[PDB]
Amino acid sequence: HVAAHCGHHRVAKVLLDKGAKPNSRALNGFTPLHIACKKNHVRVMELLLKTGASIDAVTESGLTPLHVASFMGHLPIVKNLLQRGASPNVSNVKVETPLHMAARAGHTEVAKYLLQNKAKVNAKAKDDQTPLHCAARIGHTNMVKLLLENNANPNLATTAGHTPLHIAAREGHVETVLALLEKEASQACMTKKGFTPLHVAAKYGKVRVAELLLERDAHPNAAGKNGLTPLHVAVHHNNLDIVKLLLPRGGSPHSPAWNGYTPLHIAAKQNQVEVARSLLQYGGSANAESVQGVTPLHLAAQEGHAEMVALLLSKQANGNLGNKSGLTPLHLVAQEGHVPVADVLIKHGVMVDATTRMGYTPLHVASHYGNIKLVKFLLQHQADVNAKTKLGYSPLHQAAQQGHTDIVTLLLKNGASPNEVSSDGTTPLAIAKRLGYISVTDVLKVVTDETSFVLHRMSFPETVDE
Amino acid sequence: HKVYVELQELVMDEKNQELRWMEAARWVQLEENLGENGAWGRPHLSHLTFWSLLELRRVFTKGTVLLDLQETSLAGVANQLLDRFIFEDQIRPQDREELLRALLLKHSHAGELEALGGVKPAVLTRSGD
């Protein structure tokens, strides 16, 4: 082992003819032939093979001397070992040929030498990666052309669905894609998740390849199982430089997802400016119905950023629009308690006392939220403090069920009546008691008159589903 | 030998104040039109009107014509045609930002309209409303 690691054939001759064993292996499982194959000593390898060290050998890792010669980049060792009798078709503990083990680094002459003899380049690795898959991660250009000389198909893909085009776009080697274009890789290459060649460019921001993808005249309209387009994946992780050029390149203006999701509201959700400007120019409608019925205006108002309340005016939409629940922009504003947005909205001219489909008002909802600010602002908006629900529930009953004594006191101070019995016979005092809220019950019971009836259904506002 | 011709206008919905594209008639050897119901009348011969013919000739004598352009989608043809209208000085360059929006809206058919509620003719302004 030390003779093959330090390259001395003179003492190797003596150690062989006096006495030795070529089969003796180290902790790695390495033969001395393996060490000579690693450190590129030739005379030691010749002496060991003239002794009769076996060509076939298994290291404890799982490699072969052909695999070591391919991974180390030694040409004369490969020449001697393949002349003297060897098999390129050999499998490791992960099924890998020396073609896979060579194209892991891209040594050119060993690849030509292995290809010259009988080796099947169309092959599957442990995860069934073709040598094109391992060659794509290199970024090596003519190494691809040598595999295409033996016409390895780009139709072939791994178990995960990834193709040599997919890995070439993953690592983003542009001249590799230029080489791949003449090989005519299909643009219907779809993984199980439904991804397109445009999708990884949208994710990773490798964007010089967009003109390459349009060299084969790519079509932006492409939907997988989730119906997603390069624009939705582009806006999910924003690299705006591609989208600004895709929009003149026949972009899809109002394509919905399987959730009915337009790019508008996902753009708004993570606040940003330029995307809205581009979609607006290219025709983005904030009134599109989802499967719930929520609009991009409403989902934008739920987050209620500062610049959105500015831009949304340029877009023309129903200022307050109900949902299936009846949720109006005001409802969402009260839900998130954004005073700024609520202000902008009131300035726009929304309805102050908007009611839900069940009969909940923005006061009820604010009381359930418990936001005192969302009750002062509303008081300024002139929303009635005694608005009753379709089931008799008033802002008092609601503040009691929520337990927000602060809001209940703010309501009462502003003239809210505390003696309103609901459709279940419970006043704010009855509730405060039944809920064991003492701080609230102290004010509510005294403000409230004697309970209208002797007697437990609570009250929660509707909300849009995921 | 026999072709299909479609016509779309820029109208507004009874649901909410907006602008959008709605088709109005279809042509396969005959004219077929629909009313407010969303139902198509029985096909018939098409009858033209005097001012229609006069103004088609008048505008066609001074119309820009682009033949065999290499494009793939409406957005590109729209960009190229508005560049052409700039080129022959048919419209002012300060108009393009509105015009581009004017020709980029959702082109939807009759089946949504009953949910939409119906349409009526409306006019574009300089503002965009």
Short mmCIF file of C-alpha atoms in Angstrom, two decimals, chain A residues 215-435:
data_model
loop_
_atom_site.label_atom_id
_atom_site.label_comp_id
_atom_site.label_asym_id
_atom_site.label_seq_id
_atom_site.Cartn_x
_atom_site.Cartn_y
_atom_site.Cartn_z
CA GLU A 215 -35.33 30.82 -30.32
CA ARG A 216 -37.51 27.71 -30.50
CA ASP A 217 -40.57 30.01 -30.30
CA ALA A 218 -41.79 29.15 -26.83
CA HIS A 219 -45.46 29.66 -26.05
CA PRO A 220 -46.22 31.34 -22.71
CA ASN A 221 -49.58 29.59 -22.40
CA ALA A 222 -48.58 26.41 -20.56
CA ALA A 223 -50.45 24.94 -17.58
CA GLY A 224 -49.52 21.85 -15.59
CA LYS A 225 -51.71 20.04 -13.07
CA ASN A 226 -52.01 23.21 -10.99
CA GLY A 227 -52.67 25.21 -14.14
CA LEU A 228 -49.77 27.54 -13.44
CA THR A 229 -48.02 29.67 -16.05
CA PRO A 230 -44.49 31.12 -16.14
CA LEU A 231 -46.00 34.40 -14.96
CA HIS A 232 -47.48 32.94 -11.77
CA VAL A 233 -44.23 31.21 -10.89
CA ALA A 234 -42.41 34.40 -11.83
CA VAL A 235 -44.52 36.52 -9.49
CA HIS A 236 -44.30 33.91 -6.72
CA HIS A 237 -40.55 34.58 -6.60
CA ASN A 238 -40.15 37.85 -8.44
CA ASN A 239 -37.47 38.40 -11.08
CA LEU A 240 -39.17 41.26 -12.89
CA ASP A 241 -36.61 41.61 -15.67
CA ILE A 242 -37.99 38.56 -17.44
CA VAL A 243 -41.67 39.43 -17.01
CA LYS A 244 -41.26 42.98 -18.29
CA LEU A 245 -40.01 41.46 -21.54
CA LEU A 246 -42.46 38.54 -21.57
CA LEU A 247 -45.41 40.93 -21.55
CA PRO A 248 -44.58 42.26 -25.04
CA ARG A 249 -43.72 38.65 -25.91
CA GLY A 250 -47.37 37.64 -25.94
CA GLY A 251 -47.94 37.27 -22.21
CA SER A 252 -51.07 35.77 -20.73
CA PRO A 253 -53.10 38.70 -19.36
CA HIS A 254 -55.75 37.02 -17.18
CA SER A 255 -54.92 33.33 -16.82
CA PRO A 256 -56.26 31.87 -13.55
CA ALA A 257 -54.76 29.00 -11.58
CA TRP A 258 -56.58 25.89 -10.38
CA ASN A 259 -57.54 28.07 -7.42
CA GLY A 260 -58.73 30.62 -9.95
CA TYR A 261 -55.77 32.74 -8.90
CA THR A 262 -54.71 35.62 -11.14
CA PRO A 263 -51.20 37.10 -10.89
CA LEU A 264 -52.73 40.36 -9.68
CA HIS A 265 -53.56 39.47 -6.10
CA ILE A 266 -50.45 37.36 -5.58
CA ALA A 267 -48.49 40.37 -6.81
CA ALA A 268 -50.29 42.59 -4.32
CA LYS A 269 -49.93 40.09 -1.45
CA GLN A 270 -46.16 40.61 -1.28
CA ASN A 271 -46.21 44.36 -1.73
CA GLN A 272 -44.17 45.72 -4.63
CA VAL A 273 -44.62 48.48 -7.20
CA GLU A 274 -43.36 47.70 -10.67
CA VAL A 275 -45.28 44.47 -11.18
CA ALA A 276 -48.56 46.29 -10.76
CA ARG A 277 -47.52 48.91 -13.27
CA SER A 278 -46.64 46.30 -15.88
CA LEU A 279 -49.78 44.21 -15.37
CA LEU A 280 -51.88 47.37 -15.51
CA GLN A 281 -50.33 48.35 -18.82
CA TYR A 282 -50.83 44.81 -20.12
CA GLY A 283 -54.42 44.57 -18.83
CA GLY A 284 -54.67 43.32 -15.26
CA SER A 285 -58.18 43.20 -13.80
CA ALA A 286 -58.62 43.27 -10.02
CA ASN A 287 -62.25 42.11 -10.35
CA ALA A 288 -61.58 38.50 -11.32
CA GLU A 289 -63.65 35.95 -9.44
CA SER A 290 -61.88 33.26 -7.44
CA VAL A 291 -63.41 29.94 -6.45
CA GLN A 292 -64.35 31.72 -3.23
CA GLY A 293 -65.28 34.85 -5.16
CA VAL A 294 -62.59 37.09 -3.68
CA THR A 295 -61.12 39.72 -5.98
CA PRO A 296 -57.50 40.87 -6.20
CA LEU A 297 -58.77 44.15 -4.81
CA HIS A 298 -60.11 42.37 -1.73
CA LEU A 299 -57.03 40.22 -1.16
CA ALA A 300 -54.93 43.34 -1.67
CA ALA A 301 -57.03 45.17 0.93
CA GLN A 302 -56.57 42.32 3.40
CA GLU A 303 -52.85 43.08 3.47
CA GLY A 304 -53.60 46.77 2.94
CA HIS A 305 -50.13 48.12 2.21
CA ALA A 306 -49.38 51.82 1.88
CA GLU A 307 -48.77 52.05 -1.88
CA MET A 308 -51.63 49.73 -2.84
CA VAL A 309 -54.27 52.21 -1.68
CA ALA A 310 -52.57 54.64 -4.05
CA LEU A 311 -52.37 52.46 -7.13
CA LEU A 312 -55.76 50.71 -6.86
CA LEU A 313 -57.50 54.00 -7.66
CA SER A 314 -56.04 53.96 -11.17
CA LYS A 315 -57.71 50.59 -11.60
CA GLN A 316 -61.51 50.93 -11.95
CA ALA A 317 -63.52 48.62 -9.68
CA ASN A 318 -66.58 48.44 -7.44
CA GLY A 319 -65.44 50.25 -4.31
CA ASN A 320 -67.25 47.83 -1.99
CA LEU A 321 -67.87 44.36 -3.40
CA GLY A 322 -69.53 41.56 -1.48
CA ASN A 323 -68.35 37.97 -1.51
CA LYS A 324 -70.33 34.77 -0.96
CA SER A 325 -70.00 35.61 2.73
CA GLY A 326 -70.75 39.20 1.76
CA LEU A 327 -67.26 40.39 2.75
CA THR A 328 -66.78 43.98 1.54
CA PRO A 329 -63.39 45.76 1.44
CA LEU A 330 -64.41 47.43 4.70
CA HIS A 331 -64.79 43.99 6.31
CA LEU A 332 -61.22 43.03 5.43
CA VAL A 333 -59.90 46.44 6.54
CA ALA A 334 -61.57 45.88 9.91
CA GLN A 335 -60.15 42.35 10.03
CA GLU A 336 -56.57 43.56 9.65
CA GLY A 337 -57.27 46.84 11.48
CA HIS A 338 -55.24 48.99 9.09
CA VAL A 339 -56.17 52.58 10.00
CA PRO A 340 -54.29 54.01 6.98
CA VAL A 341 -56.04 51.79 4.45
CA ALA A 342 -59.39 52.31 6.20
CA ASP A 343 -58.80 56.04 5.80
CA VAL A 344 -57.86 55.90 2.11
CA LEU A 345 -60.95 53.73 1.60
CA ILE A 346 -63.32 56.09 3.40
CA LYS A 347 -61.87 58.91 1.29
CA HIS A 348 -62.67 56.83 -1.80
CA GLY A 349 -66.33 56.76 -0.73
CA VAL A 350 -67.05 53.25 0.54
CA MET A 351 -70.19 52.45 2.56
CA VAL A 352 -69.58 53.07 6.26
CA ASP A 353 -72.32 50.75 7.55
CA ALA A 354 -71.84 47.83 5.15
CA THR A 355 -73.56 44.63 6.28
CA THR A 356 -72.63 41.00 5.67
CA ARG A 357 -74.86 38.32 4.15
CA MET A 358 -75.69 37.06 7.65
CA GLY A 359 -76.26 40.61 8.88
CA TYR A 360 -72.91 41.52 10.40
CA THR A 361 -71.71 45.11 10.07
CA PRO A 362 -68.17 46.51 10.20
CA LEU A 363 -68.91 47.44 13.81
CA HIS A 364 -69.84 43.88 14.81
CA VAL A 365 -66.71 42.65 13.02
CA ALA A 366 -64.50 45.30 14.64
CA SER A 367 -65.89 44.34 18.06
CA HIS A 368 -65.05 40.70 17.37
CA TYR A 369 -61.56 41.87 16.40
CA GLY A 370 -61.55 44.09 19.49
CA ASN A 371 -59.58 46.89 17.81
CA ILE A 372 -60.40 50.16 19.59
CA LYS A 373 -58.75 52.07 16.74
CA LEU A 374 -61.05 50.27 14.31
CA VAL A 375 -63.90 51.62 16.41
CA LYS A 376 -62.72 55.22 16.73
CA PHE A 377 -62.04 55.46 13.00
CA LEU A 378 -65.49 53.94 12.38
CA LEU A 379 -67.07 56.43 14.79
CA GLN A 380 -65.49 59.17 12.69
CA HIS A 381 -66.94 57.43 9.62
CA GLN A 382 -70.36 57.79 11.37
CA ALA A 383 -71.16 54.06 11.44
CA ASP A 384 -74.14 53.50 13.73
CA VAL A 385 -73.23 52.33 17.23
CA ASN A 386 -76.51 50.40 17.65
CA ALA A 387 -76.48 48.34 14.43
CA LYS A 388 -78.23 45.05 15.20
CA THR A 389 -77.66 41.82 13.30
CA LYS A 390 -80.31 39.74 11.56
CA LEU A 391 -80.30 37.53 14.68
CA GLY A 392 -80.65 40.35 17.21
CA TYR A 393 -76.93 40.53 17.94
CA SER A 394 -75.65 44.05 18.58
CA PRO A 395 -72.11 45.43 18.99
CA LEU A 396 -72.51 44.74 22.72
CA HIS A 397 -73.32 41.02 22.40
CA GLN A 398 -70.38 40.84 19.98
CA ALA A 399 -67.90 42.64 22.25
CA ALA A 400 -69.03 40.33 25.06
CA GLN A 401 -68.52 37.16 23.03
CA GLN A 402 -65.11 38.45 21.92
CA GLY A 403 -64.39 39.56 25.49
CA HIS A 404 -63.00 42.96 24.46
CA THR A 405 -64.14 45.07 27.40
CA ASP A 406 -62.24 48.06 25.98
CA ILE A 407 -64.31 48.08 22.77
CA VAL A 408 -67.54 47.54 24.71
CA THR A 409 -66.78 50.55 26.90
CA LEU A 410 -65.89 52.64 23.84
CA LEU A 411 -69.22 51.67 22.26
CA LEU A 412 -71.27 52.38 25.39
CA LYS A 413 -69.59 55.77 25.89
CA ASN A 414 -70.63 56.65 22.32
CA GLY A 415 -74.30 56.05 23.13
CA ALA A 416 -74.50 52.32 22.38
CA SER A 417 -77.59 50.82 23.99
CA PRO A 418 -76.71 47.94 26.37
CA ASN A 419 -80.23 46.48 26.71
CA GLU A 420 -80.76 44.82 23.32
CA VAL A 421 -81.89 41.19 23.49
CA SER A 422 -80.78 38.94 20.63
CA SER A 423 -82.73 36.14 18.93
CA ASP A 424 -81.49 33.80 21.70
CA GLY A 425 -82.61 35.91 24.67
CA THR A 426 -79.12 36.89 25.86
CA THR A 427 -78.17 40.53 26.48
CA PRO A 428 -74.58 41.78 26.83
CA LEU A 429 -74.81 41.13 30.58
CA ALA A 430 -76.14 37.58 30.13
CA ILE A 431 -73.21 36.92 27.78
CA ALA A 432 -70.50 38.58 29.91
CA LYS A 433 -71.75 36.44 32.80
CA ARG A 434 -72.04 33.13 30.92
CA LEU A 435 -68.53 33.75 29.55
#
